[PDB]
């Protein structure tokens, strides 16, 4: 939450990181939220989703 | 609810990427993995570009 | 022809969508810039109840009459 808000001191645009290794480290790269609707994208890599699946 | 979502993949399998947006069914699909005859005919499609890569 | 409104699919590659889609054009701007004229006018020349019955005067959207972008 405070990457894709940014620092206080800091704020960030509606789709937008610090850095790309600040956005790209986290399993989430991108939230919607509309009044109801919810949308999200991850970038997950191999030996994560493998985890995960086994999980 | 599962019964009431949507899910999309893309991988080396799957090469498009499903979104409802606000209302409208939008399928985006990389230039990089799929040529299939690429070409500017009809506007239903959005060309969308990188900022330091500049092409399509 | 004029039995029903025929589809579109048929005529789809006749042309594009806003093939001859035109911008407008704004709304008295010869007034407004007249108005802005005089009121610089006025600016610029500035910067540099009796007894009478009919003494007082006769006391008788969103468009921006000056012509300056506020």
């Known amino acids: 939450a405070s990457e894709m808000a940014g620092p206080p001191q800091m704020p960030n645009d509606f789709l937008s990181f610090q850095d790309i290794a600040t956005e790209?480290?986290?399993?989430?790269?991108?939230?919607?939220?509309?009044?109801?609707?919810?949308?999200?994208?991850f970038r997950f890599t191999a030996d994560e989703a493998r985890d995960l699946i086994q999980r | 609810q599962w019964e009431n979502s949507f899910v999309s993949v893309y991988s080396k399998d799957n090469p498009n990427l499903?979104?409802?947006?606000?209302?409208?069914?939008?399928?985006?699909?990389?230039?990089?993995?799929?040529?299939?005859?690429?070409?500017?005919h009809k506007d239903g499609v959005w060309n969308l570009q990188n900022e330091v890569t500049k092409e399509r | 022809?004029?039995?029903?409104?025929?589809?579109?699919?048929?005529?789809?590659?006749?042309?594009?969508?806003?093939?001859?889609?035109?911008?407008?054009?704004?709304?008295?701007?010869?007034?407004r810039r007249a108005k802005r004229r005089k009121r610089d006018e006025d600016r610029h020349d500035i910067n540099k109840?009796?007894?009478?019955?009919?003494?007082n005067v006769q006391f008788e959207g969103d468009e921006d009459v000056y012509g300056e972008v506020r």
Request: proline content about 5%.
């Open chain 2, 18 to 40: 499903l979104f409802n947006m606000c209302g409208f069914e939008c399928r985006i699909l990389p230039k990089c993995r799929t040529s299939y005859e690429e070409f500017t």
């Open chain 3, 49 to 55: 109840i009796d007894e009478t019955y009919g003494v």
């Open chain 3, 1 to 31: 022809p004029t039995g029903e409104v025929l589809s579109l699919v048929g005529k789809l590659e006749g042309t594009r969508m806003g093939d001859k889609a035109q911008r407008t054009k704004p709304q008295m701007q010869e007034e």
């Open chain 1, 24 to 41: 790209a480290a986290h399993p989430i790269r991108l939230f919607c939220r509309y009044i109801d609707r919810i949308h999200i994208f």
